[PDB]
Amino acid sequence: TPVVVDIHTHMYPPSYIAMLEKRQTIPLVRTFPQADEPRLILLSSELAALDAALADPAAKLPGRPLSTHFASLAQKMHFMDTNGIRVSVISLANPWFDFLAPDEAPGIADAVNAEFSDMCAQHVGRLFFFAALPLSAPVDAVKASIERVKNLKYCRGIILGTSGLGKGLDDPHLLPVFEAVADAKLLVFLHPHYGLPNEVYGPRSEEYGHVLPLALGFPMETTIAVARMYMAGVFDHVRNLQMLLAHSGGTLPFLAGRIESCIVHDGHLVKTGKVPKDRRTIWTVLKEQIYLDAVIYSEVGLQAAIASSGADRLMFGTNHPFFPPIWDSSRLNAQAVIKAVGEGSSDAAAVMGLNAVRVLSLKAE
Amino acid sequence: PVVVDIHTHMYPPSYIAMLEKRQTIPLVRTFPQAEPRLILLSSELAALDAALAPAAKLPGRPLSTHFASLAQKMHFMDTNGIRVSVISLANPWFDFLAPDEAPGIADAVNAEFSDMCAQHVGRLFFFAALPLSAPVDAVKASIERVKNLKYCRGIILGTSGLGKGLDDPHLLPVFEAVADAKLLVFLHPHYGLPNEVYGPRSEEYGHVLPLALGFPMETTIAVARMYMAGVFDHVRNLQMLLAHSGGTLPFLAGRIESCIVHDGHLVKTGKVPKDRRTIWTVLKEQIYLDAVIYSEVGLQAAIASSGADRLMFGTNHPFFPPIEEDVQGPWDSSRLNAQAVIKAVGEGSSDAAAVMGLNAVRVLSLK
Ligand SMILES: O=C(O)c1c[nH]c(=O)[nH]c1=O
Ligand SMILES: O=C(O)c1c[nH]c(=O)[nH]c1=O
Numbered sequence A: 001t002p003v004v005v006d007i008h009t010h011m012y013p014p015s016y017i018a019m020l021e022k023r024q025t026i027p028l029v030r031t032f033p034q035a036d037e038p039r040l041i042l043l044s045s046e047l048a049a050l051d052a053a054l055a056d057p058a059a060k061l062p063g064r065p066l067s068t069h070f071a072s073l074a075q076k077m078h079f080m081d082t083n084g085i086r087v088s089v090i091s092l093a094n095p096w097f098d099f100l101a102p103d104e105a106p107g108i109a110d111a112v113n114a115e116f117s118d119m120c121a122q123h124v125g126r127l128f129f130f131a132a133l134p135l136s137a138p139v140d141a142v143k144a145s146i147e148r149v150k151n152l153k154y155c156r157g158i159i160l161g162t163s164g165l166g167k168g169l170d171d172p173h174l175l176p177v178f179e180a181v182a183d184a185k186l187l188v189f190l191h192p193h194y195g196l197p198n199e200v201y202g203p204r205s206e207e208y209g210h211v212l213p214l215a216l217g218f219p220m221e222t223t224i225a226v227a228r229m230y231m232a233g234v235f236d237h238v239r240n241l242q243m244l245l246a247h248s249g250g251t252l253p254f255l256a257g258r259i260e261s262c263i264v265h266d267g268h269l270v271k272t273g274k275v276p277k278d279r280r281t282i283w284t285v286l287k288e289q290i291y292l293d294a295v296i297y298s299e300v301g302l303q304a305a306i307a308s309s310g311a312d313r314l315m316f317g318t319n320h321p322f323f324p325p326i327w328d329s330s331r332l333n334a335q336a337v338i339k340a341v342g343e344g345s346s347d348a349a350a351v352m353g354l355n356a357v358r359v360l361s362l363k364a365e
Numbered sequence B: 001p002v003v004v005d006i007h008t009h010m011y012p013p014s015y016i017a018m019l020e021k022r023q024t025i026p027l028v029r030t031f032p033q034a035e036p037r038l039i040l041l042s043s044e045l046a047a048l049d050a051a052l053a054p055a056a057k058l059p060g061r062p063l064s065t066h067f068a069s070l071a072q073k074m075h076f077m078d079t080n081g082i083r084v085s086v087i088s089l090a091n092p093w094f095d096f097l098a099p100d101e102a103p104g105i106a107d108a109v110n111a112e113f114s115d116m117c118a119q120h121v122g123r124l125f126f127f128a129a130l131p132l133s134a135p136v137d138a139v140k141a142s143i144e145r146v147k148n149l150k151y152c153r154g155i156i157l158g159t160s161g162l163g164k165g166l167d168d169p170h171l172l173p174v175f176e177a178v179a180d181a182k183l184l185v186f187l188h189p190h191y192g193l194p195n196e197v198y199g200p201r202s203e204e205y206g207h208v209l210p211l212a213l214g215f216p217m218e219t220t221i222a223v224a225r226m227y228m229a230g231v232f233d234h235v236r237n238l239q240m241l242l243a244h245s246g247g248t249l250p251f252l253a254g255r256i257e258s259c260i261v262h263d264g265h266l267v268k269t270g271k272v273p274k275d276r277r278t279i280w281t282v283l284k285e286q287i288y289l290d291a292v293i294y295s296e297v298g299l300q301a302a303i304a305s306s307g308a309d310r311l312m313f314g315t316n317h318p319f320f321p322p323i324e325e326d327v328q329g330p331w332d333s334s335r336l337n338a339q340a341v342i343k344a345v346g347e348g349s350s351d352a353a354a355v356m357g358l359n360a361v362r363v364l365s366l367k
């Protein structure tokens, strides 16, 4: 009519929440009886508030409220029907399986990935998913997980964070992981979580709620990780790698020109032959191996994203169920698309769903 | 008509001579392998130690005469079609000095910039720097001295403030004094991000990550902190020029706004009233953006954020000389931005005229 597809939309299955509920170290879910909803505590930047609340009963509630929407497949479908979304490509949210002990991670990752497949089977044609990987485990266990996700119905990709195997995404030990995913034609969805070292937010950090780590930390983290991939030659070494970047590439469309200029003016790089004239620029990679979600909350940002990658490589997302009304968050981004490319346009239909349908083969199984 | 460059730096010969004698970053050091090395950044410390210890690569960047020579500045202007420069000390300014030595050198160096501008009246104005490692009293004394300095049109400062960043309440009297004196504040990065974010392969990428990412991100965090702390509301006459088209601010402005209005704690504790001045409003009323963005993509975003009347052309001379071209010829790191202006707003348009210099002339009262 045409189809609306949401590619940035999360869940924590009940089995995953139940795990978080039993933890005493981040990530965790903890009930504070002065609030009905349990608190979801995921982030390094939240540790200070957690500790303050664990000592002083007068301190503010740490983390964010855990609504039922995080774990309810039924509320996901309700959200879709209420918002005119025909298909969601759901993904486990941060920090995935990153925090698990090496020995246990593969069994848990594999169980949870299968639960996602089973969730999609309940609503055939309306749900597909990005699987996540046991990246704290040895690479051979990670490969075994990739081999399993390749066989799972409704799986169309992999969601992962910026830590890789623990040394980031420019780690050559991670290359076989990108390679095995790309060879299986799975889209890689890169998503933030670790943000930036907390000291950058300053000694008044606790006064600003979650604004700085979420509004700045997250997209900057994404940008740094993809820039490191680019500099390390990951996009040339895995030529068929295709990546979807969270939050319109973080800040990448805005900084792409600056990155190119710093590269071609880097004396050391140039003098040591690391800037050959046939180098694939960041602009070329943005056109050939990167897709951007449209979760940017303004036509200013969206226009830059579109100018960087083309309208055929932008994909609508909501980031449901984060940022509930205190869903404006879904609608603002839909409006941003229209302002950017005009209502009823082929570009609008592309961004709102047809790109995702094409790239992620949102029919088969 | 007039081309004005508001993002263009010098280290006076006095400043370099000090750097040549220094034991720790920042410093200038000669190496037998080649031109002195300029070593400024924390990201350069590992390379410095390894070079002090044979065939390790040259640390820092080549210290050409372009950093120190007024004649070279004018020549660069005359080979790049620039009529007027508003020059500034380069990072890290007076930041690294002991609190005791900083006032004396800060003021001597500000006086030298005024002297330099007097050599080329009408073509040179400057942003002054402040002894922010010293007590506030000395910072205020320096402000009072720069207020009376001929050809001074503003202050350049980093993100560290007095040592606790720009949301530091003790810094509010400094912003008030500068804003009352009608001095534009040119916010410029230096400290980047903590080096661990660049990872253990950091060394293989030359300076690309600290400069291409760390700098504009540092700027963005500093201004966001100022904004969140109410600085712009508390000092309503404060005007700020942001380096590198605001770092990443025009791209993240929407995200920042969304995160604020959806922040449960902030909203429920009354920190997000309905009449709050948004970042979009501050971007149109108290913020100017330079056009040092190297692409019409980023430039168009900056223009949509602050308006074409609040964008100002700059080059960042002399930091990115051509590597395989004549440094005495036109610089591509300056031609790129000029072209970005053309692509974004059209050659010969009044918007081009505004961005290329007329905005700077108006806002900074140049003649
Ligand atoms: O903005 C987002 O995408 C998110 C923000 N904060 C989270 O904890 N998870 C997310 O997915
Ligand atoms: O990009 C820049 O503006 C700069 C980059 N690197 C420096 O050392 N100083 C600068 O001013």
Ligand SMILES: [Zn+2]
Binding pocket: A008, A010, A191, A319, A322
């Ligand atoms: Zn998300």
Ligand SMILES: [Zn+2]
Binding pocket: B007, B009, B188, B316, B319
């Ligand atoms: Zn500069």
